[PDB]
Amino acid sequence: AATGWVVLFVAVALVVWFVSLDMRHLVGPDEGRYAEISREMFASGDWVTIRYNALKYFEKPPFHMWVTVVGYELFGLGEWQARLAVALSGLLGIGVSMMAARRWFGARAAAFTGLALLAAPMWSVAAHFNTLDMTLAGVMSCVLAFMLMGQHPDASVAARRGWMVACWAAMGVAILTKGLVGIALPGLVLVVYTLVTRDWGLWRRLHLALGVVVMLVITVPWFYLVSVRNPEFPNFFFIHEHWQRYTSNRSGSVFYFLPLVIGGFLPWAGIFPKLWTAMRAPRFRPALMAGIWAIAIFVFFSISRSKLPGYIVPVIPALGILAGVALDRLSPRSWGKQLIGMAIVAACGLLASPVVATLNANHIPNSFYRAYAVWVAVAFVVMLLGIAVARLLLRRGVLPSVAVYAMGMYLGFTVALLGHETVGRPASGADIAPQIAQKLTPEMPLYGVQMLDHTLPFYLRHPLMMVGQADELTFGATVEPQRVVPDVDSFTKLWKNGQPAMAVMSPDTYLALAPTLSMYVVARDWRRVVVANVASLAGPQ
């Protein structure tokens, strides 16, 4: 019965979902870093010791790199293979959240959750950005939604056991993805829920024994292996990456995530208060569980000393579920108010498009941002078209109007995402990679002279040899000093009478080494100067 409109929708949703992965180049630092770590883990076969540019990188656990390496084995190297983990994680969050919503609030509310998570710019945009935030958010989305599945009164005891074992295994994979936060956050949400509901017997329906066992038999192996092979791992990873990161100064104010939420859930901002109403009318209270999820995690990261915008992505799935509740209780006129208001907001975004033509960040010229403002404006135009067609279909019902609205928003923010290619392409250094690879060999060193390039070594398929300040590889540079040049003088002596090699540096570094070290330019970029010691690997000078 009119299912062809759904199927087509999903089709139009899925194609744009995957093609958008390969529409733009990798942008630093996260995408190039994790793509390169996955590349080295893929070429070396060592899936235990995480390495970045041949140095140890013990700042993250390796589930994301495992998924991406599988993507490299099945689909080769490339951009969409690097974004495949966060893509499948976004699809996972949408699907499993829709499953929980359908189990609890019905099929229509589940459809509204799918439209809400599909239109949310943080979920759709973050699902195409190669960073561990989206994968953690999808896995923890399986955590929350499985918790909602097992705690259903109409579910059998075997069903509750299955969903709870899958929940503990889910949060286990979560801590295997981004550390102890995948067990700390859901436990905190559970504590707050049991505090406001006074339902302590809830803890009896969790299967702590079997669940804890299933979690340990999946998280303990890698930590034990990388801890035995590298005794310095647990102190750094558990102390410096959690306690020093949360309790001590990526800083910011308390309200640092206040706009990032309102921005990350912009198309549904008009129903932000109604979401709270969903927590009033959810034994077990699911909508209150999702609200305590979003509020608990939001407060947890709002008081952290280290803040990055991707921290609060896990709150989007729960925030989506509540959305699917609110949109389900709306009359046609009530949605009309949303179409009007969001039409005004999108029109304001369209009038505010020329602002991008004034910015120049990360030492990127103003021309690329002048080209970016065009795609921003086109994006807001797509949003206005989707809102218009949604108003045209409002007479057909609230569900199809919300469907066209969410499709227009998703296409719009997708256009705004692909428009960033105009700025990311000159920064990715992919244009000079062919000119470099014509002379560079795998046996040749590529000295990163006081510069940690995240995107160039990937497109070159060639690690760096850190020279001077190694930045986030300093630890790896100190544990294994044989793979790193400590100061610049050793780089000079390795350059003059050393082996044939190339060097990536900043233009200022080139101007500093020019009066002393004789070097010939191999490739020049807006942020990179790539030189060689022998005059054979360059051209004319």
Ligand SMILES: CC(C)=CCC/C(C)=C/CC/C(C)=C/CC/C(C)=C/CC/C(C)=C\CC/C(C)=C/CC/C(C)=C\CC/C(C)=C/CC/C(C)=C/CC/C(C)=C/CC/C(C)=C/COP(=O)(O)O
């Ligand atoms: C109810 C539902 C839905 C499901 C059911 C749930 C269920 C079954 C639950 C049953 C499970 C159960 C017995 C729960 C029992 C109840 C419970 C709370 C147990 C806790 C879990 C256990 C045992 C041990 C964990 C030990 C700790 C210290 C936990 C934290 C305790 C909490 C909460 C708040 C304290 C506040 C502080 C000072 C935290 C610092 C540590 C962290 C965590 C720092 C991360 C900050 C950060 C900034 C991280 C960024 C990561 C990162 C590397 C960013 C890098 O960023 P870039 O690289 O730059 O991108």
Ligand SMILES: [Cl-]
């Ligand atoms: Cl209203």
Ligand SMILES: [Cl-]
């Ligand atoms: Cl980009």
